[PDB]
């Protein structure tokens, strides 16, 4: 299920359960736009920032 969702506190999670990566479940900046790479890299861009 690739329908990834981000919570109010930057917690990446598929329906019901958090997504994990290196270490524990991954957490992103609070409201940054998320881009998913072709190899699994997560780029986060804080809005308004250049």
């Amino acid at each position: 299920n690739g329908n990834i969702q981000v919570g109010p506190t930057g917690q990446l999670t598929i329906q019901g359960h958090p997504v994990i990566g290196e270490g524990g479940p991954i957490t992103v900046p609070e409201g940054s736009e998320i881009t998913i790479a072709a190899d699994g890299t997560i780029s986060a861009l804080n809005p308004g920032d250049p």
């Binding site: 736009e33 881009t35 790479a37 072709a38 190899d39 890299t41 780029s43 861009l45």
Partner: protein, 260 residues
């Protein structure tokens, strides 16, 4: 529904505004002291699907993301404030202005407007008024027994009498200068008023601080180049046709989807 429809609608509206500006320029080609105006366009926002420069993979970035346009809009219009051609009318109460500056008139409600159309008359009270009744701000008052009126290059107005040989000075026809002439707000009857864009007007005598002189007996003609206008008309007609064809194609594909 379909975004291309709205994009083409914006294009059609932009072409319509361009045609309106061209028609306005052509209409008052014989207006004295008229400045042609050109519209400037720009594009609307862009919808970014993939952020440029984002990590395409490890140690690699996306060379260029996916961004889709939205349309165009006219952003502003600029008047070419250049020197027009002078035409002679042999009338002694018409003055053209060479260089920069504007004559100052007082609108009836009490405000001040700045004009460039020099063709004046004299009211029943003897004052010097513009074609329209607004009196010139320095308040030139011509006496009754007037034979000839001389307005010098430096803006000093004198009138000759019958008895005494020496002409009598009547006033000074000084003129105003702005930081940004293009920023003046334009209203009817060849009048401009100061806005926030144009700096505070500063009055000056003609021929000093970069203010132009006065030529009596001539009127400044509009700086409209009809040869450019006709080619622009051809361009806008063709662009309007192209955008209409785009609208038609979008309608055709939407209809085909509907018939499904």
């Amino acid at each position: 529904m379909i975004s291309s429809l709205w994009i083409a609608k914006t294009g059609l509206d932009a072409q319509q505004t361009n045609m309106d500006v061209i028609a306005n320029n052509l209409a008052n080609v014989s207006t004295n002291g008229f400045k042609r105006q050109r519209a400037v366009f720009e594009d609307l926002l862009y919808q970014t699907i993939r952020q440029p420069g984002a990590q395409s993979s490890e140690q690699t970035t996306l060379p260029s993301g996916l961004q889709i346009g939205t349309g165009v809009r006219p952003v502003a219009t600029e008047r070419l404030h250049s020197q027009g051609n002078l035409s002679q009318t042999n009338n002694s109460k018409d003055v053209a202005i060479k260089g920069q500056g504007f004559f100052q008139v007082m609108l009836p409600d009490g405000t001040s407007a700045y004009t460039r159309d020099g063709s004046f008359q004299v009211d029943q009270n003897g004052q010097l008024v513009t074609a329209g009744g607004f009196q010139v701000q320095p308040a030139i008052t011509i006496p009754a027994n007037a034979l000839s009126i001389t307005i010098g290059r430096d803006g000093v107005v004198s009138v000759t009498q019958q008895g005494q040989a020496a002409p009598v000075q009547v006033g000074q026809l000084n003129l105003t200068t702005f930081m940004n002439d293009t920023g003046l707000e334009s209203i009817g009857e060849n009048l401009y008023i100061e806005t926030q864009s144009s700096g505070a007007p500063n009055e000056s005598t003609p021929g000093l601080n970069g203010a132009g002189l006065l030529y009596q007996g001539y009127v400044e003609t509009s700086n409209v180049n009809v040869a450019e206008e006709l080619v622009n008309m051809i361009q806008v007609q063709r662009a309007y046709e192209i955008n209409s064809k785009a609208v038609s194609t979008t309608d055709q594909m939407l209809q085909k989807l509907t018939q499904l």
